[PDB]
């Protein structure tokens, strides 16, 4: 039949997932919707046709006619919400990060384990991106030999700095590497099958020095050594002049590849007095639209066919963990072991 | 609130539209199907859950519980099936070209006129393509000035040679200019708002002699002059070694642009002993997947909203007319006025 | 040893060649020079080290210690100046076109053949271009199979429009197709080994109203059929907004190539709010600096080795002839046979 | 007048410098050559017309008829050869790196200062590269704002692996960082005007067993922090499957640029069954041919015109200083300070 879904969270990404499930995802019905903001639930109802609205997640979980939940609430809320819906026997989708505190994660990683009758999936959608999957297949086919180095760039567009400042001046966290680099960590683990041993990170505020006063970072770089001495390089950022730069390079013994060497918007190339111009993708909903739909449909399908997707809490744990180590290494300006 | 659709044709493109309608197109349901190949209908029943199968189009429109038809039969059958379905009070989507005979088209267009309450939409899917649309927007905003020249390439992949030969020998395709270049003719018309005045076409078979034996042209080239002296160049063919080469260049007074200068498959760049490699899109279902989906949903949405899409019988007529002039100019090896 | 060379003509291109021979050309020596200028030669005199100034090739070729001339005088003067030096017993380099009147050209062709001890070289410099040569080697190696179509663009930069008008309004030379398209004709003959049978050309002025006033063509396009039904497409123009667009595409039975698909200036890529930008080459001395140098040196080496370069009067003849055929097809707006 | 030049070293690069000097460089003559390989000196006599040959450097500088020397001997021999040539009254060009020991360089630095009337130029040829100069121009013109990060890759071709092993096993190279990464260090300094504060470097051998045997690193990666907190990333290696990968990326407050994002060979694009192919430059002689010529002529002109080029022992010392730090960091696998 049709998988009834109650979503929690209708911010930036909530609205995308909401809209997709409602209108694009087959075998799916967006039945419930939770938010502490009434306007969103009114948008939910008088735009997507949502039936049961709530202001408390558990309220949604106990009374709603749903089989599964999409957790698109802020990070600090994920772990209790995952435990809570599993306890109510819901299948669970949670956005990244899985959570912030390791202990809690380790704890939730068993609740999920003890509910092996329920599907759990984490929102590392890059795993579903056609381009990443294309490369992943090349690597698995042995087309570049053995991986020696991965470089991954995740830089937010400068058009977003305005609202990042202001926000940064009103609130804090989760930090540059926990916001931007955790997808890269997962991409690194996915491709190599290895784990990260130690990291060093540096950072710089140069476009907007005021970020020094707000305890935030505009640009960051890191070097990592994996457990098998495979090398990794990261850049994270918030000030990309050209758009949304997410690029992943993989160097091997027999070749080399790059996924979005440049963030090509489409098949159009423009020529004018500037020279040869290629328009670019501008933000994550644009760049990763396809990936979001594919992860959404994967979840549903994993429930109907009783099949594991393969993105586990362990992947969530190690993501958050390595992210934290980058942050710590930045603060200390020194090398940090991930296991500590 | 839900459109039951009957499709005729389940071949190279028929199987795509069907699959799309049954599984991805909202407020639509693939209710019926028609094909002269029994294995295909078996496939519709089993894999797509299609209710009603027929081997006669006239039979489907009379007896199926449908609200609309998708015409994906070979080109020589289009006009008969449009009129029939119209006369049966069903909404009509027809693939290109609209027909192969001008006289018959004119007649069909007047039948469409009597039924000014039924929707008619032609399958010039390029108008729905994200990249083409983007370029259109650019041109509309004045980014390249006024158009001076359009060059358009539409070249089928060498790897599809066998499947083409089967298509080409199972029914009249109308030839290279009517089967391929008609997309380009429509693009030129879409972009300039002008009509083609006179043309000269040349051709050549050099790679695949089997095409001659099927009376099909392997590679064609043409020069066209529009009514306002806007210039245009076309190339069509059946032998692109690298994949599906569909490219449109628009030259203007203040710049120029190219749509799929090269048929980039994705965001993956590969580097090895051959050099820098970009994988390519391989065929129309891959390249134009999005477009096909968009035109399908636009067709369906037009029925529910009672508003026209703008791809008209007149666009079909004028396309076919120019295509026939290219064919004629090819046969005569001389300039031909579209007026004749 | 050292080849002693005298040059006639020292304007836009003349100053390039002379400056090259003096300073970068090996086993060669600039000695003589001639022009309608005391000036420009006033320039030549001082910071080139030009000893001898004249106003008559004949006057100039009379007293000088040289083995050879290098003809960079205007079109009309080539031939008469060609025979004179051969009448003087010198080896000869001349620029394109070889001349402008067919019967005249056919005459000189008889002469050159009668001085089978002397070197005659024509300045189709694209033959010495590293990129053109690379493509030629690929084609000759069978990498693309047999050539079915060649498309060639030669569009001058819009930034050069005022200097063009200045140049043109005061001294005609010699039409668009004859000025721009002749290199492309020569490239087509070079790669194919074939000759052009019939052509049709059209044209448009839309961007720069001064060209109307000057009686010049802004953009032209042409289709050509070669003697073996090999296809060819040409565009020439004066309004390339992005730079100097000289591109040549070669489609074959097993592949296709593009020489300067876009005119990349260097290895630098720029990324900003416009998107991804490739700076471009701006004019012919930039783009073909290497070619010009290589043709100068080949000529010299040709003397020293007594070995013929292979760019003949016949290549000159067929170039002007095809260019004249294009010009006539533009004027008449009909197909023209090259043999007329 | 003519600068009589004597060269030491006729290996991988020495044969190129020699050939250029004798055949391409104005106002210069390759009078003398020194090498520990007799077959090499013959080749100079037979092929380049070198009058005086030697097996010992001191020998050449005492007894040859020269004004200046090019030092292209292995790196551990540079400093003693610079000093010896200076004492003998000769101008000096030395290849990179200037030396391998800091105290020695400081001493050689003081010797250069005592002969301030003689020219000293170090062979950081990238400073002369047209594409690097263009990027430097853009940066100086504010086109990308202030520099936040430089990533630089220098990865030798896998095809050159045999020639490398000969080079590395015949004399001490100094390791990957002193031999390769030093170019990038200089670029970072040239662009930023700042010095490197601290580094961490890691490394891996995975493809070619000979390298470990020869005590060489196959691929290295490094994070550096400069004195003003400007970030830097390095990768160097000996196993690039696609060609010679020398790439330099500059990230800024207002934009970003890439020098040789990929090492495009020329203007030719190839299209076939593998997709879209760009051929690549294969090795240093190819990629930096122009640079090498420019620095040679710059050296020679500096002697004739008595104007300093501006690439100094201090540039040498600061580069060797940072490279050693990288080496130590690699060996210890921990952060190192350049000062201490
Ligand atoms: N997959 C990806 O690439 C990305 C994932 N994320 C993850 O997004 C989650 C959503 O982020 P945003 O939409 O940007 O945040 P947000 O602030 O934009 O929206 C949060 C949603 O929070 C709901 N919410 C807040 N407190 C709640 C509560 N106590 N109970 C129920 N709902 C509550 C808000 O009302 C709203 O419904 C985070 O895990 C974020 O990191 C965000 C961006 C990208
Ligand atoms: N928009 C586009 O890019 C494309 C459009 N097309 C158009 O789609 C149409 C279908 O082409 P393909 O699918 O390649 O052809 P095909 O040869 O693969 O399939 C034809 C289908 O029509 C059926 N058919 C044949 N004669 C029939 C009749 N008298 N009554 C009912 N059904 C009949 C066959 O059973 C088969 O199912 C053509 O007009 C073609 O021009 C095709 C490919 C791409
Ligand atoms: N190979 C190529 O791609 C190119 C070839 N050319 C050709 O090179 C030649 C020079 O063209 P431009 O430099 O553009 O011309 P220009 O406009 O610079 O004039 C060139 C020179 O011709 C001289 N001249 C004019 N009338 C003369 C006369 N009666 N006797 C002696 N000298 C006279 C002028 O003094 C001037 O010094 C032409 O044949 C031109 O078509 C030009 C551009 C590119
Ligand atoms: N700027 C650049 O991009 C490049 C710089 N280099 C630098 O140039 C230098 C030469 O490297 P390669 O030519 O690759 O080395 P190589 O090993 O290919 O050539 C060495 C040459 O030096 C001679 N030689 C060795 N020991 C000698 C001694 N004690 N006295 C006199 N001659 C001696 C050998 O006979 C041979 O002719 C190195 O310092 C290297 O770092 C090398 C290649 C590229
Ligand atoms: O029918 C033709 C269609 O118009 C094209 O888009 C497609 O590429 C061809 O294969 C079809 O024959
Ligand atoms: O003489 C023309 C030359 O052939 C072209 O290449 C160039 O672009 C034009 O400026 C010249 O007029
Ligand atoms: O000495 C190294 C030089 O600096 C590089 O440019 C070259 O690529 C290497 O092969 C050399 O060893």
CATH assignment at residue C335: 3.30.360.10
Considering the domain architecture, whether residues C206 and C176 belong to the same structural domain is answered as: yes
How far apart CA A23 and CA A1 sit, in angstroms, is 17
How far apart CA A263 and CA A240 sit, in angstroms, is 11
Find the distance separating the first CA and the last CA of chain A, reported in whole Å: 47
Q: Do C277 and A276 touch (CB under 8 A)?
A: yes
Collect all residues with Cβ–Cβ distance below 8 Å to D196 and sequence separation of at least 6: D185, D188, D189, D224, D225, D226, D227, D232, D322, D325, D338
How far apart CA A64 and CA A53 sit, in angstroms, is 9
Of A239, A248, A120, the residue nearest A186 (C-alpha) = A248
Considering the domain architecture, whether residues B191 and B306 belong to the same structural domain is answered as: no
Collect all residues with Cβ–Cβ distance below 8 Å to A206 and sequence separation of at least 6: A218, A219, D146, D148, D230, D253
Q: Name the 3-class secondary structure at C233.
A: strand
Q: Nearest 5°: phi and psi at B337?
A: -75, 135
Considering the domain architecture, whether residues B47 and B135 belong to the same structural domain is answered as: no
Q: At what angle are helices D78-87 and D102-114 packed, to 10 degrees?
A: 20
CATH for C67 = 3.40.50.720
Residue C2 is given by DSSP the state -
Q: Does D273 touch chain B (CB under 8 A)?
A: yes
Secondary structure in 3-state letters for chain B: CCEEEEEECCCCCHHHHHHHHHHCCCCEEEEEEECCCHHHHHHHHHHHCCCEEECCHHHHHHHCCCCEEEECCCHHHHHHHHHHHHHCCCEEEECCCCCCCHHHHHHHHHHHHHCCCCCEEECCHHHHCHHHHHHHHHHHCCCCCCEEEEEEEEEEEHHHHHHHHHHHHHCCCCCHHHHCCHHHHHHHHHHHCCCEEEEEEEEECCCCCHHHHCCCCCEEEEEEEECCCCEEEEEEEEEECCCCEEEEEEEECCCEEEECCCCECCCEEEEECCEEEECECCCHHHHCHHHHHHHHHHHHHHHHHCCCCCCCHHHHHHHHHHHHHHHHHHHHCCCEECCC
Copy the structure tokens of residue B278: 């970009």
- Tell me how crowded residue B183 is: count the other CB atoms within 10 A of its CB: 24
Q: Are A324 and A173 in contact (CB under 8 A)?
A: no
**In angstroms, what CA-CA distances link A21 with A6, A65, B78, B295?**
10, 16, 37, 21
How far apart CA B130 and CA B1 sit, in angstroms, is 27
**In angstroms, what CA-CA distances link A290 with A25, A127, C137, C145, D62?**
12, 11, 43, 39, 73
Of C43, C100, C45, the residue nearest C74 (C-alpha) = C100
CA angle B67/B71/B73 to nearest 5° reads 145
Q: Are D309 and D300 in contact (CB under 8 A)?
A: no
Collect all residues with Cβ–Cβ distance below 8 Å to A105 and sequence separation of at least 6: A79, A98, A99, A313, A316, A317, A320
Q: Name the 3-class secondary structure at C188.
A: helix
How far apart CA D41 and CA B2 sit, in angstroms, is 88
How far apart CA B82 and CA B94 sit, in angstroms, is 7
How far apart CA B195 and CA B128 sit, in angstroms, is 21
Considering the domain architecture, whether residues A282 and A293 belong to the same structural domain is answered as: no
How far apart CA A160 and CA B187 sit, in angstroms, is 36
Pairing of strands D256-259, D245-252: antiparallel
Q: Do B254 and C231 touch (CB under 8 A)?
A: no
Copy the structure tokens of residue B328: 């004629």
Pick from A7, A13, A128 the residue to mutate for probing ligand 1's pocket: most ligand atoms within 8 Å of its CB: A13
CB-nearest to D241 from A207, A235, A256 is A256
Q: Which chains touch A (3 or more CB pairs under 8 A)?
A: B, C, D
Residue C243 is given by DSSP the state S
Q: Are B326 and B201 in contact (CB under 8 A)?
A: yes
Secondary structure in 3-state letters for chain A: CCEEEEEECCCHHHHHHHHHHHHCCCCEEEEEEECCCHHHHHHHHHHHCCCEEECCHHHHHHHCCCCEEEECCCHHHHHHHHHHHHHCCCEEEECCCCCCCHHHHHHHHHHHHHCCCCCEEECCHHHHCHHHHHHHHHHHCCCCCCEEEEEEEEEEEHHHHHHHHHHCCCCCCCCHHHHHCHHHHHHHHHHHCCCEEEEEEEEECCCCHHHHCCCCCCEEEEEEEECCCCEEEEEEEEEECCCCEEEEEEEECCCEEEECCCCECCCEEEEECCEEEECECCCHHHHCHHHHHHHHHHHHHHHHCCCCCCCCHHHHHHHHHHHHHHHHHHHHCCCEECCC
How far apart CA B232 and CA B247 sit, in angstroms, is 13
**Best of C20, C257, C268 to disrupt the D interface by mutation (most D CBs within 10 Å)?**
C268
- Residues from chain B that touch A258, judged by Cβ atoms under 8 A, are 268-269, 271
Q: Are B336 and B199 in contact (CB under 8 A)?
A: yes
Q: Does C281 touch chain A (CB under 8 A)?
A: no
Q: Are A156 and D242 in contact (CB under 8 A)?
A: no
Q: Name the 3-class secondary structure at C318.
A: helix
Q: Are B3 and B304 in contact (CB under 8 A)?
A: yes
How far apart CA A34 and CA A72 sit, in angstroms, is 10
Asked, as a colleague might, if the bond just before D97 is cis with ω within 30 of 0, I would say yes
How far apart CA D3 and CA C323 sit, in angstroms, is 50
Q: Are A178 and A324 in contact (CB under 8 A)?
A: yes
* Total number of residues shown for chain A: 340
Of A77, A297, A327, the residue nearest A179 (C-alpha) = A327
Q: Can you give the residue range of the structural domain that contains C91?
A: 1-124+289-311
How far apart CA B210 and CA B223 sit, in angstroms, is 27
Instruction: Give the containing element (helix H, strand E) for C252.
Output: strand C245-252
Considering the domain architecture, whether residues A137 and A180 belong to the same structural domain is answered as: yes
How far apart CA C231 and CA C237 sit, in angstroms, is 21
Residue found by looking up tokens 């044709």 in the block = B9
Find the distance separating the first CA and the last CA of chain D, reported in whole Å: 47
Q: Are A229 and A194 in contact (CB under 8 A)?
A: no
How far apart CA D263 and CA D266 sit, in angstroms, is 9
Atom of ligand 6 nearest to the CA of C244: 8
Cα D318 → chain centroid:
14
Considering the domain architecture, whether residues D119 and D132 belong to the same structural domain is answered as: no
Collect all residues with Cβ–Cβ distance below 8 Å to D301 and sequence separation of at least 6: D27, D307
- Residues from chain D that touch B273, judged by Cβ atoms under 8 A, are 241-242
Provide the edge-to-edge strand list for the sheet that holds C91-94.
Answer: C28-34, C3-8, C68-71, C91-94, C120-122
Instruction: Give the containing element (helix H, strand E) for C6.
Output: strand C3-8
**In angstroms, what CA-CA distances link D217 with A250, D205, D220, D224, D239?**
19, 6, 7, 19, 10
CA angle B12/B268/B132 to nearest 5° reads 55
Pick from B7, B14, B43 the residue to mutate for probing ligand 2's pocket: most ligand atoms within 8 Å of its CB: B14
Q: Are B27 and B298 in contact (CB under 8 A)?
A: no
How far apart CA A191 and CA A150 sit, in angstroms, is 9
Copy the structure tokens of residue B91: 């909404």
* Total number of residues shown for chain D: 340
Secondary structure in 3-state letters for chain D: CCEEEEEECCCCCHHHHHHHHHHCCCCEEEEEEECCCHHHHHHHHHHHCCCEEECCHHHHHHHCCCCEEEECCCHHHHHHHHHHHHHCCCEEEECCCCCCCHHHHHHHHHHHHHCCCCCEEECCHHHHCHHHHHHHHHHHCCCCCCEEEEEEEEEEEHHHHHHHHHHHHHCCCCCHHHHCHHHHHHHHHHHHCCCEEEEEEEEECCCCCHHHHCCCCCEEEEEEEECCCCEEEEEEEEEECCCCEEEEEEEECCCEEEECCCCECCCEEEEECCEEEECECCCHHHHCHHHHHHHHHHHHHHHHHCCCCCCCHHHHHHHHHHHHHHHHHHHHCCCEECCC
- The answer for A 202-241 residues in CB contact with D (under 8 A) is 202-204, 206-207, 219, 221-223, 225, 229-231, 233, 235, 239-241
Pairing of strands B120-122, B91-94: parallel
Q: Does B242 touch chain D (CB under 8 A)?
A: yes
Q: Are A157 and A283 in contact (CB under 8 A)?
A: yes
Considering the domain architecture, whether residues D163 and D268 belong to the same structural domain is answered as: yes
How far apart CA A280 and CA A286 sit, in angstroms, is 10
Q: Do C242 and B256 touch (CB under 8 A)?
A: yes
Considering the domain architecture, whether residues D129 and D272 belong to the same structural domain is answered as: yes
Collect all residues with Cβ–Cβ distance below 8 Å to C263 and sequence separation of at least 6: C242, C243, C244, C245, C246, C247, C280, C281, C287, D267
Nearest ligand to the C-alpha of residue B244? 5
Of B26, B15, B5, the residue nearest B69 (C-alpha) = B5
Considering the domain architecture, whether residues D160 and D119 belong to the same structural domain is answered as: no
* Total number of residues shown for chain C: 340
Pocket-forming residues, ligand 4, beta carbon under 6 Å = D 8-14, 34-37, 40, 57, 72-75, 77, 95-96, 123, 125, 167, 170-171, 179, 284
Q: A152-171 in b/e burial notation, b at 16+ Cβ within 10 A?
A: bbbbbbbebbeebbeebeee
Q: Name the 3-class secondary structure at C120.
A: strand
- Residues from chain D that touch A254, judged by Cβ atoms under 8 A, are 207, 241
Q: Do A275 and C275 touch (CB under 8 A)?
A: no
Residue found by looking up tokens 């919400």 in the block = A81
- Tell me how crowded residue D80 is: count the other CB atoms within 10 A of its CB: 15
Alpha-carbon dihedral of residues C46, C49, C52, C56, nearest 10 degrees? -80
Copy the structure tokens of residue B21: 């309608």
Q: Is the dihedral of CA C185, C186, C187, C192 positive or negative?
A: positive
Please list the residues that pair with B121 across neighbouring strands. B93
Q: Least CA distance to B271: which residue of chain D? A: D242
Considering the domain architecture, whether residues C164 and C293 belong to the same structural domain is answered as: no
Q: Are D164 and D238 in contact (CB under 8 A)?
A: yes
Alpha-carbon dihedral of residues C146, C151, C152, C153, nearest 10 degrees? -160
Domain count, chain A: 2
Residues of chain C immediately before an interruption (C to N > 2.5 Å): none
How far apart CA A33 and CA A40 sit, in angstroms, is 9
CA angle D33/D35/D37 to nearest 5° reads 130
Please list the residues that pair with B19 across neighbouring strands. none
Copy the structure tokens of residue D238: 């000996």
**In angstroms, what CA-CA distances link C62 with B138, C6, C57, C72, C303?**
62, 11, 8, 18, 21
Q: Do B278 and D275 touch (CB under 8 A)?
A: yes
Residue C183 is given by DSSP the state H
Q: Does B277 touch chain D (CB under 8 A)?
A: yes
Asked, as a colleague might, if the bond just before D253 is cis with ω within 30 of 0, I would say no
Please list the residues that pair with B71 across neighbouring strands. B8, B94
Instruction: Considering only CA atoms, give the Rg of chain B.
Output: 20
Considering the domain architecture, whether residues A275 and A144 belong to the same structural domain is answered as: yes
D284 lines ligand 7 (CB under 6 A): yes
Considering the domain architecture, whether residues C129 and C235 belong to the same structural domain is answered as: yes
Pairing of strands D3-8, D68-71: parallel
How far apart CA A67 and CA B206 sit, in angstroms, is 61
Atom of ligand 1 nearest to the CA of A174: 41
Q: Do D253 and A207 touch (CB under 8 A)?
A: yes
Pick from B6, B7, B9, B38 the residue to mutate for probing ligand 2's pocket: most ligand atoms within 8 Å of its CB: B9
Residue C95 is given by DSSP the state P
**In angstroms, what CA-CA distances link B301 with B190, B295, B296, B297, B313?**
22, 10, 9, 6, 19
**In angstroms, what CA-CA distances link D269 with B278, C244, C249, C282, D196?**
11, 18, 9, 20, 40
Instruction: Give the containing element (helix H, strand E) for C290.
Output: helix C289-305
How far apart CA C223 and CA B236 sit, in angstroms, is 14
Asked, as a colleague might, if the bond just before C97 is cis with ω within 30 of 0, I would say yes
Copy the structure tokens of residue B134: 């983007």
């Amino acid at each position: 039949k049709t998988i009834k879904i109650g979503i929690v969270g209708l911010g930036r990404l909530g609205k995308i997932h909401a809209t997709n499930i409602a209108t694009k995802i087959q075998h799916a019905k967006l039945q419930a919707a939770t938010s502490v903001v009434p306007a969103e639930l009114d948008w939910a109802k008088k735009e997507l046709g949502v039936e049961e609205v709530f202001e408390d997640f558990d309220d949604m979980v106990q009374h709603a006619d749903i089989d599964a939940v999409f957790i698109v609430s802020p990070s600090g809320f994920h772990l209790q919400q995952i435990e809570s819906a599993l306890n109510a026997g819901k299948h669970v989708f949670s956005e990244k990060p899985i959570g912030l505190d390791i202990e809690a994660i380790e704890h939730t990683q068993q609740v999920i384990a003890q509910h092996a009758n329920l599907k759990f999936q984490l929102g590392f959608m890059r795993r579903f991106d056609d381009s990443y999957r294309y490369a992943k297949q090349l690597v698995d086919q042995g087309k570049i030999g053995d991986i020696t180095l991965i470089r991954s760039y995740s830089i937010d567009p400068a058009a977003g700095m305005a609202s990042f400042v202001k926000f940064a001046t009103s609130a804090n966290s989760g930090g540059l590497f926990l916001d931007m680099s955790i997808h890269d960590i997962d991409v690194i683990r996915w491709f190599t099958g290895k784990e990260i041993d130690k990291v060093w990170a540096i950072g710089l505020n140069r476009a907007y020095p005021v970020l020094d006063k707000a305890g935030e970072l505009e640009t960051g770089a890191a070097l990592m050594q994996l457990e098998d001495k495979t090398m990794a390089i990261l850049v994270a950022g918030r000030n990309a002049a050209h758009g949304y730069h997410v690029e992943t390079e993989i160097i091997g013994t027999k070749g080399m590849l790059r996924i979005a060497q440049v963030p090509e918007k489409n098949l159009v190339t423009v020529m004018n007095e500037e020279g040869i111009i290629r328009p670019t993708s501008q933000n994550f909903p644009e760049r990763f639209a396809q990936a979001f739909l594919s992860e959404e449909q994967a979840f549903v399908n994993s429930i109907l066919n009783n099949q594991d997707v393969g993105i586990t809490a362990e992947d969530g744990l190690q993501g958050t963990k390595a992210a934290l180590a980058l942050q710590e290494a930045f603060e200390k300006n020194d090398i940090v072991q991930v296991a500590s």
